[PDB]
């Protein structure tokens, strides 16, 4: 999704079945993904998977896990409770850690989608 | 036998239609009522939703959750018969919807 246009964001929310949702934990949430979340919420919720990137917070891993628990709590209160999100680290040579990537691909392999009326 | 519906404290019910749309008096006990299809029995009963201002969240066939009511007094407009209040709609608590924390998905 080109992230500068509700003109696209609305109809992608209409057609999509899975949405993996790209927060950056260095910055917390943003109103672009809040807008997209409400558009999906009103047009009918597709299956949402959180992923939080840019975990180069500091050497302060206490801050890292505190921001991660705030993100997962704000995520659970806003898509269904206990929804799945994956913590991606920094990019290593063009792409992400293949461990978390393989686990993510496993979950979307066993996603088991659902009907919506529209 | 341990409850108003089987033994469960809550039961998912399919809303048929909003009772008392055309009541003129706001916040009236005819207005804050709604027909609901019990699934584990499969039959139609009528139920309350408190705060007819937040009646308008639940509309039609939105798998609401149906709890007990428990009249703790003798209110004036309170009709008898109903003992079912609505506690959630489509998964999310409509009390939380009324104080506008959460959001109703569809």
């Amino acid at each position: 999704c080109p992230a500068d246009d509700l003109n696209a964001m609305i109809d992608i929310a209409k057609i999509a079945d899975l949405v993996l949702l790209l927060i950056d934990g260095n910055f917390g949430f943003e109103m672009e993904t809040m807008e997209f979340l409400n558009i999906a919420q009103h047009h009918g919720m597709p299956r949402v998977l959180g992923v939080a990137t840019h975990l180069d917070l500091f050497k302060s891993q206490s801050t890292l896990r505190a921001s991660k628990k705030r993100l997962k709590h704000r995520f659970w209160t806003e898509v269904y409770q206990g929804a799945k999100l994956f913590y991606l680290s920094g990019v290593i040579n063009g792409r992400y850690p293949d461990r978390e990537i393989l686990n993510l691909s496993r979950f979307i392999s066993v996603m088991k989608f659902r009907p919506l009326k529209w | 036998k341990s409850s108003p519906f089987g033994g469960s404290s809550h039961a998912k019910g399919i809303v048929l239609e909003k009772l008392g749309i055309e009541s003129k008096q706001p916040n009236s006990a005819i207005r804050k009522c709604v027909r609901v299809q019990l699934i584990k029995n499969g039959k139609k009963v009528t139920a309350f939703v408190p705060n007819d201002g937040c009646l308008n969240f639940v509309d039609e066939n939105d798998e609401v959750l149906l709890a007990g009511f428990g009249r703790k007094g003798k209110a004036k407009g309170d009709i008898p018969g109903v003992r079912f209040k609505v506690v959630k709609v489509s998964g999310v608590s409509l009390l939380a919807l009324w104080k506008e924390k959460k959001e109703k998905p569809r």
């Binding site: 659902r114 | 469960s8 404290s9 039961a11 998912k12 699934i39 584990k40 066939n61 798998e63």
Partner: peptide
Amino acid sequence: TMQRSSDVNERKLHVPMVD
């Protein structure tokens, strides 16, 4: 028990739709 089961079996109740 029946207490931890007769409230949790309502997770199997929904609106009947088709896919």
